[PDB]
Structure 1
Amino acid sequence: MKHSLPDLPYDYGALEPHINAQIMQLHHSKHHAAFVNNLNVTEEKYQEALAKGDVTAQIALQPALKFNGGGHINHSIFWTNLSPNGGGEPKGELLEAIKRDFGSFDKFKEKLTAASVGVQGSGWGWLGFNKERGHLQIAACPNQDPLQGTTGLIPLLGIDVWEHAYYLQYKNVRPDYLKAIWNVINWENVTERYMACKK
């Protein structure tokens, strides 16, 4: 199929001052681009191995596939979760679900911040939808392990806590980044993803 790097839905500087333009440009044009390129190389090798019945080769390719495939999945969602027009609080049924499942919007922010701050090493914090239980759920994922492929939860909002997501601007202080990012959450997109889950 040949995966492609999706265009960013805004200018690299559109999320300033919360995420600076240098980070956005590196994150999209270098990090995400590399995931796409390496995913395409890995998928081609997997097709060769499947055609030959080389199970050893398939298994040896799994780390690169999950890492670059997961990186592509996660970053593709991440870009749509952010917006220069973002921030504030969601409305409608998503806000109702947040209050129901987490108590309040403020308590939800505390819980998702805590999950994202708690990642040791590289990883992601997620607000997801549990289809079987029919409610929201917070989870963390290591490295580039993607939410749906590894947990079954449908991703609604992801917070990248790899050092490349914040280090140039916030250095070691991940909590300052986690506080800033709330100003650019695209609740319109998160709402669209949530509504798609229900019926």
Structure 2
Amino acid sequence: MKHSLPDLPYDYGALEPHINAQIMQLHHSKHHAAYVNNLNVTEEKYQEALAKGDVTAQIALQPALKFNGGGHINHSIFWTNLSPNGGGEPKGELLEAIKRDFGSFDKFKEKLTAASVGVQGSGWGWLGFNKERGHLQIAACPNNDPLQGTTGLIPLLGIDVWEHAYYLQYKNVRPDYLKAIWNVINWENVTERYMACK
């Protein structure tokens, strides 16, 4: 009945040298912890305002709900999208879909990189599934706005481009972080999410 912080499925240092253990520990144990806690606080406030029919209070809570709820949604997916066992290319129908919809795996990587580099301020780049069209789709989201809740696309792979996702290690050079992160993408998890859509 309450949202909880999922354990990281690997050690804080498991993604070194691509994302260092200081980032992983802060990102999970400080940043995500705060979203979950503030999400639960906001949800309780929203339950009270709903039961009273206080629409002003409901609307005033929307920023916190989207930001912290989106934070919890996005980071929960993000941790499973990475793995010490990741890197390389997907296989099977996910790879065939990537080649069909984006031309090639490398072309897909440069489109998702571009979407991720192009976020001005805080946000996320996403590979999603468009269930209406039955094909893959790339989108960028601001701050912690979550993909499915704001666009209807089913999330397959997210890349956090908030500065806390990379700054300690890569400083201002966001492209260096994006170069590195391809080495730890958990294509097994992205594949499972894709198959679940179809």
TM-score range, shorter chain: over 0.9
Once residues 66 and 110 of structure 2 are traced to their aligned partners in structure 1, the CA distance between those partners, rounded to angstroms, is 29
Once residues 128 and 42 of structure 1 are traced to their aligned partners in structure 2, the CA distance between those partners, rounded to angstroms, is 27
How much has 1:80 moved relative to structure 2? 0.2
TM-score (norm 2): 0.99
How far does the alpha carbon of each residue in 1:32-83 deviate from its partner, in whole angstroms, 9 at most, with x for none? Answer: 0000000000000001101111000000000000000000000000000000
Once residues 63 and 127 of structure 1 are traced to their aligned partners in structure 2, the CA distance between those partners, rounded to angstroms, is 24
Once residues 51 and 97 of structure 2 are traced to their aligned partners in structure 1, the CA distance between those partners, rounded to angstroms, is 46
The 3-state SS of whatever aligns with 2:121 is coil
How much has 1:178 moved relative to structure 2? 0.2
How much has 1:104 moved relative to structure 2? 0.3
Query: Aligned residue for 2:164?
Result: 164
Query: Aligned residue for 1:4?
Result: 4
How much has 1:138 moved relative to structure 2? 0.2
How much has 1:155 moved relative to structure 2? 0.1
Aligned-residue CA RMSD in angstroms? 0.4
How much has 1:165 moved relative to structure 2? 0.1
Once residues 99 and 51 of structure 1 are traced to their aligned partners in structure 2, the CA distance between those partners, rounded to angstroms, is 50
Name structure 2 gaps, 5 residues minimum.
none
How many residues are paired up?
198
Once residues 116 and 88 of structure 1 are traced to their aligned partners in structure 2, the CA distance between those partners, rounded to angstroms, is 19
How much has 1:168 moved relative to structure 2? 0.3
Name structure 1 gaps, 5 residues minimum.
none
How far does the alpha carbon of each residue in 1:89-139 deviate from its partner, in whole angstroms, 9 at most, with x for none? Answer: 000000000000000000000000000000000000000000000000000
How much has 1:16 moved relative to structure 2? 0.4
The 3-state SS of whatever aligns with 2:61 is helix
The percent identity for this pair of structures is 99
Once residues 53 and 110 of structure 2 are traced to their aligned partners in structure 1, the CA distance between those partners, rounded to angstroms, is 48
Q: How does 1:2-151 map to 2 (within 5 A)?
A: 2-151=2-151
Once residues 147 and 112 of structure 1 are traced to their aligned partners in structure 2, the CA distance between those partners, rounded to angstroms, is 14
The 3-state SS of whatever aligns with 1:13 is coil
Once residues 106 and 63 of structure 1 are traced to their aligned partners in structure 2, the CA distance between those partners, rounded to angstroms, is 37
The 3-state SS of whatever aligns with 1:125 is strand
Once residues 105 and 69 of structure 2 are traced to their aligned partners in structure 1, the CA distance between those partners, rounded to angstroms, is 32
TM-score (norm 1): 0.99
The 3-state SS of whatever aligns with 1:5 is coil
How far does the alpha carbon of each residue in 1:121-178 deviate from its partner, in whole angstroms, 9 at most, with x for none? Answer: 0000000000000000000000000000000000000000000000000000000000
Query: Aligned residue for 2:174?
Result: 174
